[PDB]
């Protein structure tokens, strides 16, 4: 259901409440820890992060390498937090390489 | 404001065996392009026109007949390898013209020294009907 989500960030690391049926980035905005975004539709690198523990559903994914899914990277805008996962923010370029 | 690098002839070029995809008469009479990169080591890379060549450890300067071919080779060099490149356009005059990256930073990265060219401050659904620009030389989009 509403598992706690941890996000490392240059601002620090905060915890927010959000139901497994919603994207981590969408409820983050409801609380108010600012994150980057652009398209909001899963087709760009702007909202990129990677994970420390757990894993998010890859069903809400597109315009990604046939590897970015299992090598760590993910999109905050298009992702369902199936567990009490710990993710990274501001992770576009070390993804952009 | 980012004095562009000047082309340095005597810079070697990759080890190639020759191809029928190289330059033609257009390079003789109108223009051709030249790309340069710096090659941490001597390696094999696919030529944007033919087969495979070997980039030398040290300066590499390659002459192509199309700007699009240059950008293709540049993209391949930039993300498959990690190599910074620049290319120029040469005329039959002996003029060279630094082309890319124009202001030192790649265009996918916003730079505070660039002006807006061809930007319309409205949504695409608010162009006038063609009847409104009939018999005047303007195009409804150029407005």
């Amino acid at each position: 259901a509403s598992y706690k989500v941890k996000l490392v960030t240059p601002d620090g690391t905060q915890e927010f409440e959000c139901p497994s049926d919603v994207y981590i980035l969408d409820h983050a905005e409801e609380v108010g820890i600012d994150l980057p975004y652009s398209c909001r539709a899963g087709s760009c690198s702007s909202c990129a992060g990677k994970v420390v523990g757990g894993e998010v559903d890859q069903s809400d994914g597109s315009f990604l390498d046939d590897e970015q899914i299992e090598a760590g990277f993910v999109l905050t805008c298009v992702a369902y937090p199936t567990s009490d996962v710990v993710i990274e923010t501001h992770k576009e370029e070390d993804l952009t390489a | 404001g980012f004095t562009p690098p000047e082309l340095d002839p005597n810079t070697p070029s990759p080890i190639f065996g020759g191809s029928t995809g190289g330059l033609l008469r257009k390079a003789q009479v109108e223009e051709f392009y030249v790309i340069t990169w710096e090659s941490p080591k001597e390696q094999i890379f696919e030529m944007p026109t033919g087969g495979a060549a070997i980039m030398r450890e040290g300066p590499n300067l390659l002459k192509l007949a199309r700007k699009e071919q240059c950008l293709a080779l540049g993209t391949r060099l930039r993300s498959k390898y990690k190599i910074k490149y620049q290319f120029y356009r040469v005329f039959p005059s002996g003029e060279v013209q630094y082309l890319h990256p124009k202001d030192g930073v790649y265009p996918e990265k916003v730079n505070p020294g660039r002006q807006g060219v061809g930007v319309n401050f409205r949504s695409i659904g608010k162009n006038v009907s063609p009847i409104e620009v009939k018999f005047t030389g303007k195009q409804p989009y150029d407005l």
């Binding site: 652009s38 087709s43 | 293709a72 996918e108 660039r114 002006q115 319309n120 695409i124």
Partner: protein
């Protein structure tokens, strides 16, 4: 020379810029969005009319439009 226009619905994703084969587009500062960025077309004399940029635009409708126009030898992508 084809004519490329950028409209204010641009979200400044920059996917189109990363798509163009001939380095026609660019990213420039702006204030109308959350990226403070918008696409410019300062070098349309090199545009081949490929319209890859339009297939990369995630807006609806598009924010980058390519109107094919008078042809040059640069526009026709001719190596001879």
């Amino acid at each position: 020379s084809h004519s490329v226009k950028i409209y204010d619905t641009c979200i400044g994703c920059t996917q189109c810029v990363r798509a163009c084969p001939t380095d026609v587009l660019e990213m420039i500062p702006w204030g109308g969005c959350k990226a403070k960025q918008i696409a410019s077309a300062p070098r349309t004399e090199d545009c081949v009319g490929c319209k890859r940029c339009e297939s990369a635009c995630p807006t609806d409708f598009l924010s980058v439009r390519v109107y094919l126009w008078h042809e040059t030898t640069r526009s026709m992508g001719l190596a001879y």
